[PDB]
Amino acid sequence: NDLPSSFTGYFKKFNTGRKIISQEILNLIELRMRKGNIQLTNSAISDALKEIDSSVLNVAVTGETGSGKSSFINTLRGIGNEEEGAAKTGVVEVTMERHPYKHPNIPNVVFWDLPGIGSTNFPPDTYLEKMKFYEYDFFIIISATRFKKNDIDIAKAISMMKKEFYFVRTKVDSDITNEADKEKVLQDIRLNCVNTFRENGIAEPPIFLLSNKNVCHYDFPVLMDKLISDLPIYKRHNFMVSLPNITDSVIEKKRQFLKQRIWLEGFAADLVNIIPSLTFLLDSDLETLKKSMKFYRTVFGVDETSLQRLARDWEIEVDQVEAMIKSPAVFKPTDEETIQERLSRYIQEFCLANGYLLPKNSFLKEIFYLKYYFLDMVTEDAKTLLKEICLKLGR
Ligand SMILES: Nc1nc2c(ncn2[C@@H]2O[C@H](COP(=O)(O)OP(=O)(O)O)[C@@H](O)[C@H]2O)c(=O)[nH]1
Numbered sequence: 211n212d213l214p215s216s217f218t219g220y221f222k223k224f225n226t227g228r229k230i231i232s233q234e235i236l237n238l239i240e241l242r243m244r245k246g247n248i249q250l251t252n253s254a255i256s257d258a259l260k261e262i263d264s265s266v267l268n269v270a271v272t273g274e275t276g277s278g279k280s281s282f283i284n285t286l287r288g289i290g291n292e293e294e295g296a297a298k299t300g301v302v303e304v305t306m307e308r309h310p311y312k313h314p315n316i317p318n319v320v321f322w323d324l325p326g327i328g329s330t331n332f333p334p335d336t337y338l339e340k341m342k343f344y345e346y347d348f349f350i351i352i353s354a355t356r357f358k359k360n361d362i363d364i365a366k367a368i369s370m371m372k373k374e375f376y377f378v379r380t381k382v383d384s385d386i387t388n389e390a391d392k393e394k395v396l397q398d399i400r401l402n403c404v405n406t407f408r409e410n411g412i413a414e415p416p417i418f419l420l421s422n423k424n425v426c427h428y429d430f431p432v433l434m435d436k437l438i439s440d441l442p443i444y445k446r447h448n449f450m451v452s453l454p455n456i457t458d459s460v461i462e463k464k465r466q467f468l469k470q471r472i473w474l475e476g477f478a479a480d481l482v483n484i485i486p487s488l489t490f491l492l493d494s495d496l497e498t499l500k501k502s503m504k505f506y507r508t509v510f511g512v513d514e515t516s517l518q519r520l521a522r523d524w525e526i527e528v529d530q531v532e533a534m535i536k537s538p539a540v541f542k543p544t545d546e547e548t549i550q551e552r553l554s555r556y557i558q559e560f561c562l563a564n565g566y567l568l569p570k571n572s573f574l575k576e577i578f579y580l581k582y583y584f585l586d587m588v589t590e591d592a593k594t595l596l597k598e599i600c601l602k603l604g605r
Pocket residue numbers: 273274275276277278279280281282298299300301380381382383384420421422423
């Protein structure tokens with residue numbers, strides 16, 4: 211129940227697949243805290259954060275023309291082929307150049323649309339050299355059918371360089387519709403794929419059947435979860451926040467990663483022995499808080515632009531969508547109450563329901579309790595809209 215134990219003890223609420231930082235680093239930080247190395251302690255936390263924040267992810271998306279590379283890239287960034295930044299889909303024209311696509315709101319996440327190896331006449335290894343294989347964190351190998359020798363030869367060349375790769379079977383929704391009017395058409399699809407793999411001399415590998423048109427369906431959710439799990443721990447945060455907000459589970463998962471960063475950031479800023487009251491609101495902390503709110507809102511898809519997007523799909527005024535959630539009104543000017551009074555209330559509300567999160571008389575600085583409050587609010591808003599977005603589908 212001492213401070214060092216409370217610091218590491220906080221991460222016990224998140225399982226190994228949801229850790230933003232390794233147990234070895236946490237133990238090392240706790241050791242330094244217990245040894246009294248205040249310098250080394252803040253240095254280790256600060257370095258951990260810098261490594262988390264600066265992590266850049268480069269995903270290589272390959273597969274033959276028509277597989278769904280461009281669509282996959284759009285789907286992962288949560289954008290339509292129409293939106294700006296989209297990787298145009300249905301492009302048949304041959305190309306020999308890789309094309310980068312950054313997540314619209316997370317610059318540190320970059321997807322590379324690589325031309326199918328078949329489109330080029332490059333042998334597996336030359337293809338990888340030409341595509342600069344060394345720049346990628348992992349490869350997504352897409353097939354809309356049952357995979358072919360080219361896909362496996364690329365994977366074999368990738369494993370030989372000890373890089374991660376995932377076999378993704380797209381268009382399952384097509385096979386389902388074409389074989390109907392759901393059913394285990396998936397079972398057969400997966401079966402044909404395994405035969406192709408066994409056929410190419412390898413043990414049955416993991417296969418993700420999915421539809422770029424329905425991110426909430428099939429193996430898309432487990433794939434996104436597996437990508438995060440397999441990623442070196444420090445890279446998880448940045449990629450996790452860029453992922454599609456498909457279910458309450460994924461939303462909660464984003465919240466868990468964000469809560470851990472607030473905690474690290476809070477300890478890095480130094481704890482205090484004064485209760486959080488926000489008697490005064492510095493303009494600097496106010497600007498920081500406004501930036502945190504905008505970031506959280508963007509991450510969970512409840513930012514201005516996103517709410518505007520929903521204002522389209524739903525033939526209603528943006529004002530009405532905003533009325534459905536809470537985060538949009540936090541910084542909306544009002545003559546009836548100052549921002550300081552509002553944030554002071556939030557802190558009191560937060561600490562009453564959550565406590566101070568630390569041993570008696572130890573507290574995080576006020577701005578962090580506000581970040582936690584903002585995070586819960588936005589995550590709630592996200593679940594609210596998602597509830598409507600999905601159920602309103604009907605298909
Ligand atoms: N039904 C369905 N169509 C898909 C899927 N993925 C891609 N497509 C479509 O199939 C075509 C080829 O996709 P595209 O993403 O441009 O793949 P690329 O040529 O490999 O980069 C386009 O008409 C897409 O809209 C999917 O999962 N389901």
